[PDB]
């Protein structure tokens, strides 16, 4: 209820939203039903088109047109954007030669240059080169501004999700709007796409970039638009604001365009109609362009041209139907489509089992088209499980497929040849990026990265200090000429001690075994191995620090460093460096079942063998592995009871593959490589380092934490013609966060021999080395000859494993 009574006269676009009822003229009124009674005669204005033409040439002003072709329409700040160019002899803007912004060329009493976002829905990122004929204005600004060969979305790849994330910088998890469509069980509340209730504020947290604007005194200009408020209404209005009086112009602007998802849901990503679509985009580009060359503002505005995701092939007949798996459809709910959401239909039916519809859904077709997870054995590069509104049990659709409970679903509720929504590493879902402007560099390619970045930078566009996000601050800095963030290093918390040889052999009582009983040239040599003498070979970017309060040790090896934990009794990390020239060597059989007492490390803060005898189901592995020791005598060291940690029999199989064959295999390819593995504990999912009283399970008897996965970062010179450990320029890292898991479900062909399926669990797993800073509160890097920026870069890259 509204009084739709009073009058939108002098009120068109108003900047606040007015307290109903009293009614509303905002560009957002419509979506209410809120708007005065005269908004559309007012304020959506028609009459006559969009262009002038030589004959509307210096007309008498006629308030009923579209828009302007009269002498005072610039001052007004309303001409059509095609204005001077029809009656003044001037060039479209995507007809000039681009010219280097070196600063910003704004009118007197601008205090920033202004920042405009356009966004386009369903905008995949192989439509910058696919379509680059058809559009000449958004080219001009790729090729003249700042662009990347494509954006990398958030899981899951739809519309609300992502756009929010480019509001925030957070994780879906984290922001809330986990889904185009979601259950918030504390709320008992349900979000669609139709419907009131995505309105209420109760689902969207975080701090979207309007609030932070407003908070610190920087106005924003309202960022939504009615969806029948036609393009070229936007782009004037917008143009209209420009001209606002200092103390009211707002400093950022958003246009949102439903093109091209909504075409290309209906014709496919690549559909013959969806040029058009593109073509159009394009026009509104132009007009936009033109509108601020007008206004002398071409100069002076940063321009960001963003998509939310891509769009992929998906058809009626690609549909998997748990009916044809679960015997109980009708017990379940499930959110459908390019990603799967199961709960129990009704929670007073205590019969429902998430085990038994796991199981019925785990590799039971020979070409299943998903995968079933509890959320928290997904990937953890999708941060997609500490969300009340995310359902304990998902399902991963492969690309080109839909999800269904029931064949009904699908045909009484084909329609349409394209969507997205899956996994965010996929390629057909990369959308675009494209800066321009004084703030962004010229002519100038960067890395793909994700987002969750952007937010970060748009603050920095407009001089605010960012809400803590999920962006990684600076790395983004070589996207711009200036308004660079300069971060510290995280000081460490936490120093190490370095034990020297404290305890007896005898003092051990731990149930270990090991057939190990054998100069001076070579006595002081392994002293001094244990002094740290090869630690520069084997960590060759600093220590990580320990960003926590903690206890542990420094341990030094002739083929590895640790930082032991005294609290976790094992490893935080272990380093070590693989030349292109080494070699793997088994495992003799007088060291099998061998585990050495470490006689820097107390009894008291040391693993137990015993232990993993009792413990029926848990075994250990090494961190450091002894296939990759440098001699025999070297080999030992890998035995000690401080490089053991707990592993399952089945992820052994996984472990010892990487081991005994990736890393040689990386070390031939990349000519060396220095790897950091470590264990990761996070028990309730939320993607950070658990504390110790957060551990859910301990090697039977004993307080051997057992961790939930398990890393490593891999890290060699971009420049492969030189070895890792002699390395004068950029890195080059692939990282990944294994689940340490007792069976091996989730690779429907582990029954087969590793070769054929390792590799692949562990691409699926592939991680940013930021990914395991928060798992671990470890800082990686710490001391190298880069620049701290293209560090931050580094860390926030993710080997993705799909090809061009
Ligand atoms: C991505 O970046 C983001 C942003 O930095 C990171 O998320 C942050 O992580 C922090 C660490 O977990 C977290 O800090 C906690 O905040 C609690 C108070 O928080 C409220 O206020 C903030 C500030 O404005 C607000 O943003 C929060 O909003 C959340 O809540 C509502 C949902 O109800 C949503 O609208 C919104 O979307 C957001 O939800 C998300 O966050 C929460 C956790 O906050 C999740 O549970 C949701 O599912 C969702 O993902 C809040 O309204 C504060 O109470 C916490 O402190 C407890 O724990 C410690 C123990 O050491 C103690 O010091 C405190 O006293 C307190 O303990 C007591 O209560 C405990 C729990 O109730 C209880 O167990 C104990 O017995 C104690 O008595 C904590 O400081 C921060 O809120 C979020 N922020 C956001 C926006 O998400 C994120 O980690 C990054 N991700 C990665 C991978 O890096
Ligand atoms: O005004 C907006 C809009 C803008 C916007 O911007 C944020 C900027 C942040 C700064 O940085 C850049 C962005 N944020 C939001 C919300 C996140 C706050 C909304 N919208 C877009 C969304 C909905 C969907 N839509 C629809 O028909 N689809 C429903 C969902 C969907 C899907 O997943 N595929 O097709 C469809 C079709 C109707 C409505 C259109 C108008
Ligand atoms: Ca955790
Ligand atoms: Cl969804
Ligand atoms: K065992
Ligand atoms: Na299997
Ligand atoms: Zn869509």
Redesign the pocket.
């Given at each position: 209820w509204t009084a739709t009574s009073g009058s939108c006269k002098g009120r068109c676009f108003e900047l606040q939203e007015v307290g109903p009822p009293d009614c509303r003229c905002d560009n957002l009124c419509k979506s209410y039903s809120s708007c005065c009674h005269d908004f559309d005669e007012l304020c959506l204005k028609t009459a006559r088109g969009w262009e002038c033409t030589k004959d509307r040439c210096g007309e008498v002003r006629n308030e009923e047109n579209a828009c302007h072709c009269s002498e005072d329409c610039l001052s007004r700040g309303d001409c059509c954007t095609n204005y001077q160019v029809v009656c003044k002899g001037e060039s479209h803007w995507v007809d000039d030669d681009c010219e280097e912004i070196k600063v910003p060329e704004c009118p007197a009493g601008f205090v920033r240059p202004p920042l405009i976002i356009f966004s386009v829905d369903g905008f995949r990122a192989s439509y910058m080169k696919k379509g680059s004929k058809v559009m000449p204005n958004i080219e001009k600004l790729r090729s003249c501004g700042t662009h990347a060969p494509y954006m990398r979305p958030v899981y899951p790849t739809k519309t609300f999700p992502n756009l929010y994330t480019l509001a925030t910088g957070?994780?879906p998890?984290?922001?809330?709007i986990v889904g185009n469509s979601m259950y918030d069980p504390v709320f008992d509340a349900s979000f669609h796409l139709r419907g009131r209730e995505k309105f209420n504020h109760?689902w969207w947290?975080?701090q979207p970039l309007w609030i932070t604007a407003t908070k610190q005194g920087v106005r924003a200009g309202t960022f939504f638009w009615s969806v029948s408020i036609p393009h070229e209404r936007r782009i004037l209005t917008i143009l209209q604001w420009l001209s606002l009086p200092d103390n009211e112009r707002p400093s950022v602007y958003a246009f949102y365009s439903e093109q091209p998802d909504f075409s290309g849901h209906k014709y496919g990503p690549f559909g013959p109609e969806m040029t058009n679509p593109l073509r159009e985009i394009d026009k509104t580009v132009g007009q936009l362009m033109d509108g601020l060359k007008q206004l002398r503002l071409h100069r002076c505005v940063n321009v960001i041209f963003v998509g939310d995701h891509g769009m992929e092939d998906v058809t009626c007949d690609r549909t998997e139907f748990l009916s044809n798996y679960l015997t109980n459809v009708d017990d379940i709910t499930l959110v459908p489509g390019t990603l799967g959401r199961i709960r129990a239909k009704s929670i007073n039916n205590s019969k429902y089992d998430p085990k038994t519809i796991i199981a019925a859904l785990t590799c039971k077709k020979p070409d299943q088209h998903f995968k079933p997870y509890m959320k928290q054995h997904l990937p953890k590069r999708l941060?997609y499980a500490?969300?009340?509104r995310i359902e304990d049990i998902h399902l991963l659709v492969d690309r080109r497929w839909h999800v269904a409970r029931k064949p009904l679903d699908v045909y009484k509720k084909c329609f349409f040849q394209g969507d997205h929504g899956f996994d965010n590493k996929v390629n057909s879902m990369q959308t675009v990026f494209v800066g321009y402007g004084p703030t962004f560099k010229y002519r100038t390619k960067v890395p793909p990265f994700e987002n969750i970045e952007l937010y970060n930078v748009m603050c920095d566009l407009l001089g605010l200090k960012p809400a803590?996000?999920?962006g990684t601050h600076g790395s983004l800095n070589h996207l711009l000429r200036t308004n660079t963030f300069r971060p510290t290093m995280p000081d460490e918390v936490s120093r190490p001690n370095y034990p020297g040889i404290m305890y007896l052999q005898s003092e051990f009582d731990l149930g270990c075994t090991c057939d190990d009983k054998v100069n001076k040239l070579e006595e002081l040599n392994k002293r001094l191995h244990t002094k740290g003498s090869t630690k520069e070979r084997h960590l060759l970017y600093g220590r990580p620090a320990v960003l926590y309060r903690t206890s542990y040790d420094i341990l030094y090896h002739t083929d590895f460093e640790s930082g032991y934990s005294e609290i976790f009794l094992m490893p935080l990390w272990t380093s070590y460096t693989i030349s292109k020239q080494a070699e793997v060597s088994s495992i003799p059989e007088h060291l099998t079942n061998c585990v050495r007492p470490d006689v820097r490390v107390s009894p008291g803060f040391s693993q137990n063998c015993l232990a993993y005898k009792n413990d029926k189901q848990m075994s250990y592995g090494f961190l450091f592995p002894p296939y990759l020791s440098s001699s025999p005598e070297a080999k030992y060291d890998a035995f000690l009871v401080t490089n053991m940690v707990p592993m399952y029999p089945a992820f052994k199989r996984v472990w010892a593959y990487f081991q005994r064959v990736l890393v040689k295999k990386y070390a031939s390819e990349r000519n060396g490589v220095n790897v950091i593995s470590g264990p990761i504990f996070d028990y309730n999912y939320?993607?950070?380092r658990d504390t110790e009283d957060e551990i859910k399970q301990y090697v039977e008897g004993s307080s051997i934490p057992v961790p939930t996965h398990y890393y490593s970062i891999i890290t060699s010179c971009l420049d492969f013609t030189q070895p890792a450990d002699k390395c004068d320029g950029p890195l080059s890292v692939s990282s990944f966060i294994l689940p340490h898991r007792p069976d091996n479900d989730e690779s429907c062909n582990s029954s087969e021999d590793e070769s054929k399926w390792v590799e692949e669990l562990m691409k699926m797993h592939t991680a940013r080395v930021r990914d395991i800073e928060?798992l671990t509160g470890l800082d990686f890097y710490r001391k190298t000859s880069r620049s701290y920026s293209e560090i931050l870069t580094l860390k926030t890259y993710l080997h993705t494993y799909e090809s061009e």
């Open positions: 957070l994780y998890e984290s922001h809330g109760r947290g975080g941060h500490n969300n009340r803590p996000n999920n939320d993607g950070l928060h």
